């Protein structure tokens, strides 16, 4: 009947449902997983992402309590140049556009705009490619897999991906995080194996693109609260992550944004003794990451009743080694949970 | 139990004749061995001890080969009687010529013993008759043996043998009768479980298509069987592609059903629908259900086809001709508009109540509207079917009067109880035996043997305490402690059962063997005395038929034979030979006998557990089939159908509620595998509505059916008498309460819904209607009437988060204390302007 075996190889599979707001890393992490266990427009969209970022800075230049002025106003036409292509559906990306982007990227008024990135919706890998593309200002270059993982693609709809880890089947579903897409996630709520809720750790001082008035982290907190209580979700433990550890660490080292400013619960907060930080790790950063960690744990603490547990870890998506190690640990956890049924 | 007890033997007759054959075998063997014994060594001084045995032997073999007789089915009783009487005369005549001091008591004694046991076993005599014959034979034998303490001793032997015998006999008889009752109930269960299976099969086939019904007839995945007795409710729903779909609304059906008999409407409707069924089977199309003025069918959904479009449209033509005939057969100038469309559909069943297999997709609504936008008589076809219509039919681009559509026109008795009684009788008999063994010494004021009195008291206490165990086990006083009872009868296992019974039956022999160390061997009187004693003792072991065969047989064997062979050297010598002979033959008897009886016991147990399994199974089956019937139909209509072929029932009053999920289709994305998970969500919702029905107060409501996003409920139907304790029309309120509930319910459902909210609108009407059913082998109960399409097309015009209510209902409900903010006046098909009322008092700003 060829079905008596297929249902069991399904039972021999891992369903990995990914959650998290937009730009969290869901696309990033599924890209990572494919590389770790497994046709040219890729190079194109990157520029488009570039084309986005180069706009976002200049657009928001007039959208701050100071109108962000160039240190070199003579390149204002350059600005206007970008404002001339401010909405170009297609774009050949001519080399003069590359020059116009770079020249302002080295401008320090542009630098003052970029440094206040929190006060407006903006991609994360912006400054990275703002220098990486100077290497591919020409056209005969194939970007790095590092750029591939840093490629900003908007997740919209069920993106199923299968693979094998040492004779164990794994089937993850990339799913967007924007508000409208959240009407979809329900479709995947049917007997999924493990529920990877990632959160953009560094997105505590910024607001979501929905209303630009609700803190990205506070938003995701409310989200996770809701889902941790979902009448079909009280029975499967949750694996939690904190993406962009590095970016958060840079936020701390800059000391410009204040978590207590955004969330005063950190001022009166104490570092937990069970902290297992890496060598050469700012203890204040350890304090803050575990602060957020418990802030999410709190929700997984007020309920669950021993039927579904949290296992909060840490993650920097551009660090394939981080991904590998934490994912191996998660593989242990999920291969345990697989038979919990 | 008059001729039933007759039937008992009717199937007991074979085993009875078997037992009888083996019995006669033993009897003849005994007479033979006694003849040859009295011939070979001694007592050759006379031939009347052997020739009678020979003629009796040939009489026995004539009895044996005679049992093959045909005029026998009632006369066997007297056969047994007369055969016993022959045994009687033979033994007594061989007996009387004694009292010379060289004959022994125990010879003829043992003879009588065997006679009594064999009669008790096989001869089936009525308790009174069996008993009187036994006692008469005993007294006659002992009184002929007469030609002070010895005589009462022998009489005691007689009576205790009678006791053990009546015990065995009644046990055999009750076993027979009970076992017969058991096999009767078991065959009852077989022949009723078959028909329960058949009825539920008719059910499941009348609810699901043949293919998928027979799929459910595999009972492989017990998930659907777990629905009889947990995050997502389980359900089987598959996406299927490229099938055809056909709707048909009866043109002006309402105006047709104007003044029907509420019963003639039933017949004509079911008539035309049986016509349609007659079609679909031939046209190879699967009808699905019937929606009031409309009805619909599919083409090759379970079984994919390529001509499915042909099948469907030709079925449509058949419907056209059928409504034509009826239009001039009954002379009802009423036609039906019909529409068709082809595509893909997700098909399955949702909901736990009134659920029937159904189908959904945008293509569903497409064909639906194309019908309710299609002209009467000429089928409204789609481009989706025109692309492979293959123009073999009257292609006509039927443009509406307002997406590439076209038109076509052609071309008691407890095992424990047993144990208690048999223990009782065993201890009593052993008791009176040792009683005689004591009163054997009547001359001495105090008898010498003290160990006899010691073991007397000991075994007395042991058996009497086991008696108390049994009697507090039965009469259930629980005077000492129920924990003691439980922990102390846990030891009454199955094998320790064997061992404790073995010891309890062994004890009488050692008890009377308290008298073995003394001198008897000189006294030839005491010799025959103790011989009679030990044989009467060993023959007791039979009574615990609940105890094993090899075990009890070997135990009795050794415990009898050991000390007698021992004292064969302690003596009155040749009598040793004769007594060991009779002891041996008796052993073989009792061995085979208890064998066959323990067989009877194992058989009774087997039958009991078997019939018990069948009873459990029929219980479960009737449960499940009742559950499916209650799913498909209400209860009072189940009453009627059992007494009536059809059903029909008008109701001048009745409330009807429609709940339509507005934002479903927009919530529904198809970019997944048809987004069928959204339909899983829908099924979850419908189940959470079904649970609202099983509320006790909400048991009063009847869920009619569901139509995709539509949930349909009504009441005023189970109401068969207005009660003085209930306001007659208050159900309209509790029905309305239902609205207030589920409208709230979806919010909780929405509470588990992130960044989206389902919003349904609910339309309510009240008034007259009718209820009927479709047909047999295809069961479906439904309702119709003006209120029906009124409320349907009403809730069609409602607004979510608000309750659209008919104005006449609005009055009576306002009188029921409820608040409404006026909506206005709406336009209904065939009803023009109608005043409506919204329930929530300006739920929005105003
Ligand atoms: N530096 C750094 N950037 C990261 C990391 N993870 C994700 N990002 C950045 O986040 C941005 C968006 O990542 P993405 O994978 O699309 O998020 P998402 O969760 O999939 O969001 P969406 O696809 O539903 S819109 C990218 O520009 C990427 O550079 C990280 O670990 N370190
Ligand atoms: Mg994403």
In angstroms, what CA-CA distances link B819 with A45, B315, B595, B730?
59, 50, 85, 16
DSSP H or E run through A13: strand A13-19
CB atoms under 10 Å from CB of A103, counted, come to 14
Q: Which helix (H) or strand (E) holds B25?
A: helix B4-40
Neighbours of B811 (CB within 10 A): 11
Pairing of strands B406-408, B648-651: unpaired
Asked whether A312 lines ligand 1 (CB < 6 A), one says no
CA distances from A111 to A131, B149, B633 (A): 13, 133, 75
Question: Is B293 annotated as a binding-site member?
Answer: yes
CA distances from A25 to A176, A188, A201 (A): 10, 19, 11
For B624-687, where are the E strands, in sequence order?
A: 648-651, 655-661
**DSSP conformation letters of A283-328:** HHHHHHHHHHHHHHHHHHHSS-TTSS-B------TT-HHHHHHHHH
- A138 CA → ligand 1 middle, Å: 25
Sequence ranges of the domains in chain B = 4-177+415-522, 238-408, 646-838
Taking the CA atoms of B517, B518, B520 and B521 in sequence, report the sign of the dihedral they define: positive
Task: Please report the atom of ligand 1 found closest to the CA of residue A174.
Answer: 20
Question: Nearest 10 degrees: CA dihedral of B70, B75, B79, B85?
Answer: -160
* Residue A192 tokens, joined: 């999924």
Residues of chain B found within 8 Å of residue A340, distances taken between Cβ atoms: none
User: Which among B728, B740, B742 is positioned nearest to B812, based on CA atoms?
Assistant: B728
What CATH topology corresponds to A41-149? GI Alpha 1, domain 2-like (1.10.400)
Q: How far, in Å, are A268, B157, B545 from residue B440 at the CA level? A: 105, 13, 31
Q: Quote the CA–CA distance of B516 and B737 in Å, as a whole number.
A: 92
Residue of A18, A21, A27, A156 with the most ligand 1 atoms within 8 Å of its CB, for mutation: A27
Tokens matching residue B387? 């692309």
CA-CA distance, B752 to A194, in Å (whole number)?
Answer: 19
For domain A6-22+155-338, the CATH class is: alpha beta
Distance separating alpha carbons of residues B767 and B777, to the nearest angstrom: 32
CB contact under 8 A, B672 and A187: yes
CA distance B451 to B608: 46
B200 vs B182: CA distance, rounded Å: 26
Q: d(Cα B93, Cα B55) in Å, to the nearest integer? A: 14
Q: Give the Cα separation of B342 and B334 in Å (integer).
A: 27
Q: A187, B677: Cβ pair inside 8 Å?
A: yes
Measured CA to CA, the distance from residue A13 to residue A191 in angstroms comes to: 11
Q: Judge whether B186 and B608 are in contact, CB under 8 Å.
A: no
- Identify the DSSP state of A106: H
Instruction: Please indicate if the annotation marks A255 as binding a ligand.
Output: no
Q: Which of A149, A125, A134, A185 is nearest to A34 (CA)?
A: A149
**What DSSP element (H or E) covers B10?**
helix B4-40
Shortest CA gap A10–chain B (Å): 15
Q: How far is CA A145 from CA A96, A149, A150, in A?
A: 27, 6, 8
**Cβ contacts (< 8 Å) between B754 and chain A: which residues?**
182-183, 185-186, 223, 226-227, 230
Distance CA(A204)–CA(A196), nearest Å, equals 19
Cα B240 → chain centroid: 39
Distance (Å) of CA B341 to CA B338, B349, B515, B674, B708: 11, 22, 104, 18, 18
Contact B680 A190 (CB under 8 A): yes
**Residue with CA nearest ligand 1 atom 11:** A23
Superfamily of domain B646-838: Nucleotide cyclase, GGDEF domain (3.30.70.1230)
E-strand ranges in B662-815 read 702-707, 710-714, 760-766, 769-773, 781-784, 803-806
User: Dihedrals φ, ψ of A68, to 5°?
Assistant: -65, 110
Determine contact, residues A33/A159, Cβ cutoff 8 Å. no
Nearest Cα to A71, choosing from A107, A111, A117, A114?
A107
HSE, side-chain direction, 13 A CA sphere, residue A282: 14
Taking Cα atoms as reference points, which of B285, B312, B301 lies closest to residue B360?
A: B301
Q: What does the block give as tokens for A242?
A: 């904190």
Taking the centre of ligand 1 as the mean of its atom positions, its distance from the CA of residue A245, in whole angstroms, is: 12
B622: its two tokens? 């009737």
Which residues from A are below 8 Å from B232, CB to CB?
A: 189-191, 232
- The DSSP line for B85-102 is HHHHHHHHHHHHS-----
Residues on chain B touching A234 (C-beta within 8 angstroms): 231
Q: Which residues contact B8 (CB under 8 A, 6 or more apart)?
A: B176, B177, B180
Q: Which architecture does CATH list for B238-408? A: 2-Layer Sandwich (3.30)
A226 marked as binding residue = no
Smallest Cβ distance to B754: which of A187, A190, A226?
Answer: A226
The residue annotated as part of the active site, out of A174, A193, A295, A315, is: A174
Region for A13 from its dihedrals, namely left if φ exceeds 0, alpha if ψ lies in -120 to 50, beta otherwise: beta
Domain layout of chain A by residue ranges:
6-22+155-338, 41-149
**Is any ligand 1 atom within 6 A of the Cβ of residue A26?**
yes
The residues near A337 (Cβ < 8 Å, ≥ 6 apart) are: A193, A194, A236, A237
> Which structural technique was applied?
cryo-EM
How far from A40 is each of A88, A154, B111, CA to CA, in Å? Answer: 21, 18, 111
- In angstroms, the CA A76 to CA B841 distance is 59
Please state, in angstroms and rounded to a whole number, the distance separating the CA atoms of residues B2 and B6. 7
Closest among B433, B630, B666 to B534, alpha carbons compared: B433
Nearest-angstrom CA–CA distance, B156 and B149: 11
Name the interface residues of A facing B (CB cutoff 8 Å). Answer: 157-158, 179-180, 182-191, 223, 226-227, 230-232, 234-235
3-state secondary structure of A227: helix
CA of A29 to the centre of ligand 2 (A): 9
CB contact under 8 A, A187 and B678: yes
| Residue from B754, B757, B759 to probe the interface with A (highest A Cβ count within 10 Å) | B754
Long-range contacts of B487-493 (CB under 8 A, 24+ apart): none
Tokens read off for A313? 């870890």
* b/e per residue A12-46 (b: at least 16 CB within 10 A): ebbbbbbbbbbbbbbbbbbbbbeeeeeeeeeeeeb
Please give the full DSSP string across B596-609, using - where no structure is assigned: HHHHHHHHHHHHHH
What's the number of CA atoms in the CB half-sphere (13 Å) around residue B290?
22
Distance A153 CA to ligand 1 centre (A): 9
Tell me the C-alpha to C-alpha distance, in Å, between residue B92 and each of B87, B145, B538.
Answer: 9, 9, 23
Contact between residue B84 and residue B123 where contact means Cβ atoms under 8 Å apart: yes
* DSSP 8-class letter at B234: P
Residues of chain B neighbouring A231 (CB-CB closer than 8 A): 231, 752
- The breaks in chain B (C to N more than 2.5 Å) occur after 101, 147, 229, 402, 411, 571
Only one residue has tokens 């010799």, namely B527
Helix (H) or strand (E) holding B343: strand B336-348
Cβ pair B756:A182 closer than 8 A: yes
A28 as an active site residue: the answer is yes
- Beta carbons of B672 and A235 less than 8 Å apart: no
What residues contact B681, with CB distance under 8 A and at least 6 apart?
A186
User: What is the C-alpha to C-alpha distance for residues A277 and B806, in angstroms, rounded to an integer?
Assistant: 69
Question: Residue B357 and residue B349: Cα distance in Å, rounded?
Answer: 4
Helix ranges (DSSP H) in A38-149: 41-61, 76-84, 95-106, 108-115, 126-132, 145-149
Active site residue A96: no
A155 annotated as a binding-site residue = yes
Asked whether B754 and A185 are in contact (CB, 8 A), the reply is: yes
Sign of CA dihedral A70, A72, A77, A79: negative
Query: What order do you get walking across the sheet with B710-714 strand by strand?
Result: B702-707, B710-714, B655-661, B760-766, B803-806, B832-838, B821-828
Q: Which two tokens stand for residue B87?
A: 């045994």
Cα–Cα separations (whole angstroms), residue A56 to A79, A117, A155: 12, 10, 20
List the single residue in B232, B669, B680 with the smallest CB-CB distance to A184.
Answer: B669
Using the Cα atoms of residue A37, residue A42, residue A43 and residue A48 in order, give the sign of their dihedral: negative
Optimal mutation site among A157, A184, A191, A227, interface B, most CBs of chain B within 10 A: A184
Contacts of A184 in chain B (CB under 8 A): 669
**Residue of A189, A195, A307 to mutate, interface with B, max B Cβ within 10 Å:** A189
Alpha-carbon gap, residue A150 to A129, rounded angstroms: 9
- Candidates B755, B758, B759: best to mutate against A (most CBs of A within 10 A) is B755
State the catalytic residue, choosing from A152, A216, A287, A293. A152
Q: Give the CA count within 13 Å in the CB-facing half-sphere of B85.
A: 9
User: Are B824 and B836 in contact, with CB atoms under 8 Å apart?
Assistant: yes
For residue A202 and ligand 1, the question of a CB distance below 6 A is answered with: no
Q: With contact defined as beta carbons under 8 Å apart, do B667 and A183 qualify? A: yes
Separation between Cα atoms, residue B187 and residue B492, nearest integer Å: 33
Would you tell me how many other CB atoms lie within 10 Å of the CB of residue B398?
18
A203 is in an annotated binding site: no
Is there a common fold for B238-408 and B646-838? yes
A192 CB near ligand 1 (under 6 Å): no
State the Cα–Cα distance between residues B738 and B657, nearest whole angstrom.
9
Question: Between chains, do A232 and B672 touch, taking CB under 8 Å as contact?
Answer: no
First to last CA, chain A: 26
The distance of B226 to chain A (nearest Cα, Å) reads 17
Residues in chain A with CB shorter than 8 Å from the CB of B746 are none
CA nearest to B168, candidates B419, B427, B543 = B543
**Kind of pairing, strands A194-200 and A238-243?**
parallel
* CA–CA separation, B669 and B118 (whole Å): 86
Q: Do B752 and A157 make contact, defined as CB atoms within 8 angstroms?
A: no
Chain B residue set in contact with A, beta carbons under 8 Å: 231-232, 667, 669, 671-672, 675, 677-678, 680-681, 752-756
CB atoms within 10 A of CB A266: 17
Contact A185 B678 (CB under 8 A): no
Tokens 């990033």, residue located = A28
Residues forming beta bridges with residue B346, ordered by sequence position: B239, B360
Q: Ramachandran region of residue B242, left (φ > 0), alpha (ψ -120 to 50) or beta?
A: left
Q: Which atom of ligand 1 is nearest to the CA of A18?
A: 19
């Amino acid at each position: 009947k060829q079905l008596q075996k297929d249902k069991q190889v399904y039972r021999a599979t891992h369903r990995l449902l990914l959650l998290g707001a937009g730009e969290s890393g869901k696309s990033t992490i599924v890209k990572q997983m494919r590389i770790l266990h497994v046709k040219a427009t890729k190079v194109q969209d990157i520029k488009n992402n570039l084309k986005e970022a180069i706009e976002t800075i200049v657009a928001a230049m007039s959208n701050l309590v100071p109108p962000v002025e160039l240190a070199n106003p003579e390149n204002q036409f350059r600005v206007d140049y970008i404002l001339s292509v401010m909405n170009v559906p297609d774009f050949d990306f001519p080399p003069e556009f590359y020059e116009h982007a770079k020249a302002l990227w080295e401008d320090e008024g542009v630098r003052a705009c970029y440094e206040r990135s929190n006060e407006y919706q903006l991609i994360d890998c912006a400054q990275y490619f703002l220098d990486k593309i100077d290497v591919i200002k020409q056209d005969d270059y194939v970007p790095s897999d590092q750029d591939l993982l840093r490629c900003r693609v908007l997740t919209s709809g069920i993106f199923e991906t299968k693979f094998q880890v040492d004779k164990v089947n794994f089937h993850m579903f990339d799913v967007g995080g924007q508000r409208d897409e959240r009407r979809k996630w329900i479709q995947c709520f049917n007997d999924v194996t493990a529920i990877i809720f990632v959160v953009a750790s560094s997105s505590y001082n910024m607001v979501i693109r929905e209303d630009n008035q609700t803190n990205r982290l506070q938003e995701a907190l409310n989200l996770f609260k809701s889902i941790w209580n979902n009448r079909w979700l009280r029975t499967i433990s949750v694996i939690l992550f904190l993406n962009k550890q590095d970016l958060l660490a840079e936020k701390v080292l800059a000391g410009k944004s204040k978590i207590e400013d955004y969330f005063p619960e950190f001022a009166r907060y104490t570092t937990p003794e069970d902290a297992t930080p890496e060598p050469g790790e700012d203890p204040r950063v350890t304090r803050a990451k575990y602060f957020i960690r418990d802030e999410f744990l709190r929700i997984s603490t007020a309920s669950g009743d021993g039927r579904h547990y949290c296992y909060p870890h840490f993650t920097c998506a551009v660090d394939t080694e981080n991904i590998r190690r934490v994912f191996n640990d998660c593989r242990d956890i999920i291969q345990r949970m697989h038979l919990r049924q | 139990s008059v001729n039933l007890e007759e039937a008992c033997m009717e199937r007991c007759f074979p085993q009875t004749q078997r037992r009888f054959r083996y019995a006669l075998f033993y009897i003849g063997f005994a007479c033979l061995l006694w003849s040859i014994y009295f011939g070979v060594h001694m007592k050759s001084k006379l031939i009347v001890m052997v020739a009678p045995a020979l003629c009796f032997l040939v009489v026995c073999v004539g009895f044996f080969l005679f049992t093959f007789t045909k005029l026998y089915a009632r006369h066997y009783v007297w056969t047994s009687l007369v055969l016993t009487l022959l045994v009687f005369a033979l033994t007594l005549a061989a007996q009387f010529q004694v009292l010379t001091p060289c004959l022994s008591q125990v010879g003829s004694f043992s003879m009588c013993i065997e006679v009594l046991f064999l009669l008790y076993t096989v001869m089936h005599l009525p308790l009174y008759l069996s008993l009187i014959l036994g006692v008469a034979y005993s007294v006659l034998f002992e009184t002929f043996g007469y030609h002070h303490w010895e005589l009462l001793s022998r009489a005691l032997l007689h009576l205790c043998i009678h006791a053990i015998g009546i015990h065995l006999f009644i046990m055999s008889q009750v076993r027979s009768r009970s076992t017969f009752l058991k096999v009767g109930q078991s065959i009852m269960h077989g022949k009723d479980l078959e028909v329960e299976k058949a009825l539920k099969e008719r059910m499941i086939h009348s609810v699901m298509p043949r293919i998928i019904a027979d799929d459910l007839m595999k009972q492989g995945d017990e998930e659907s069987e777990n629905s009889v007795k947990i995050a997502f409710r389980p359900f089987k729903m598959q996406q299927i592609e490229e099938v055809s779909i056909l709707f048909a609304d009866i043109v002006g059906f309402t105006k047709m059903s104007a003044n029907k008999s509420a019963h003639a409407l039933v017949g004509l409707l079911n008539d035309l629908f049986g016509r349609f069924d007659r079609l679909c089977e031939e046209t190879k199309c699967e009808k699905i259900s019937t929606l009031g003025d409309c009805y619909y069918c599919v083409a090759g959904c379970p079984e994919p086809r390529a001509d499915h479009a042909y099948c469907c449209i030709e079925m449509g033509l058949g419907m056209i001709r059928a409504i034509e005939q009826f239009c001039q057969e009954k002379k009802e100038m009423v036609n039906m508009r019909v529409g068709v469309h082809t595509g893909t559909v997700l098909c399955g069943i949702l909901g736990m109540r009134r659920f029937k297999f159904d189908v959904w997709s945008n293509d569903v609504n497409l064909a639906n509207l194309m019908e309710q936008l299609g002209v009467a008589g000429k089928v409204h076809i789609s481009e989706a079917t025109a692309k492979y219509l293959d123009d073999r039919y009257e292609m006509e681009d039927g443009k509406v009067t307002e997406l590439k559509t076209y038109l076509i026109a052609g071309q008691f008795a407890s095992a424990t109880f047993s144990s208690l009684l048999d223990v009782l009788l065993s201890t009593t008999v052993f008791l009176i035996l040792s009683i005689t063994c004591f009163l054997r010494y009547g001359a001495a004021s105090t008898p010498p043997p003290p160990a006899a009195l010691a073991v007397f008291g000991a075994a007395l206490l042991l058996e009497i305490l086991s008696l108390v165990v049994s009697v507090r086990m039965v009469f259930f006083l629980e005077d000492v402690m129920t924990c003691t009872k439980r922990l102390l009868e846990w030891i009454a296992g199955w094998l320790p059962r064997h061992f404790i019974g073995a010891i309890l039956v062994s004890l009488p022999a050692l008890a009377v063997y308290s008298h073995v160390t003394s001198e008897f061997e000189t006294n030839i009187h005491s010799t025959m005395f103790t011989g009679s004693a030990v044989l009467t003792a060993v023959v007791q072991y039979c009574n615990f038929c609940q105890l094993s065969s090899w075990m009890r047989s070997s135990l009795a064997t050794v415990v009898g034979a050991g000390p007698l062979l021992l004292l064969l050297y302690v003596s009155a010598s040749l009598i040793g030979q004769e007594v060991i002979l009779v002891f041996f033959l008796l052993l073989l008897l009792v061995w085979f006998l208890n064998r066959e009886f323990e067989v009877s016991y194992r058989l009774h147990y087997h039958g009991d557990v078997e019939a018990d399994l069948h009873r459990t199974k029929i219980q479960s089956m009737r449960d499940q089939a009742d559950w499916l019937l209650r799913n498909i139909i209400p209860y009072h209509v189940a009453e009627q159908l059992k007494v009536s072929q059809t059903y029909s029932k008008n109701h001048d009053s009745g409330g009807v509620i429609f709940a339509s999920i507005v934002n479903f289709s927009e919530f529904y994305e198809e970019n997944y595998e048809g987004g069928k998970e959204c339909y899983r969500v829908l099924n979850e919702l419908i189940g959470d509505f079904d649970e609202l029905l099983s509320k006790p107060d909400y048991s009063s409501i009847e869920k009619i059916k569901t139509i995709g996003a539509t949930y349909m409920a009504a009441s005023g139907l189970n109401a068969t008498q207005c009660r003085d304790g209930s306001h007659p029309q208050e159900h309209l309120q509790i029905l309305f309460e239902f609205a207030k509930e589920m409208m709230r319910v979806v919010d909780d459902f929405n509470n588990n819904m992130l960044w989206f909210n389902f919003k349904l609108r609910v339309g309510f009407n009240h008034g007259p209607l009718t209820a009927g059913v479709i047909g047999t082998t295809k069961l479906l109960y439904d309702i119709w009437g003006d209120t029906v399409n009124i409320a349907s097309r009403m809730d069609t015009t409602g607004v979510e988060c608000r309750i659209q209510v008919s104005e006449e209902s609005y009055r009576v409900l306002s009188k029921m204390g409820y608040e409404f903010d006026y909506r206005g006046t709406v336009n209904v098909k065939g009803k023009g302007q109608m005043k409506t009322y919204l329930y929530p008092k300006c739920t929005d700003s105003g």
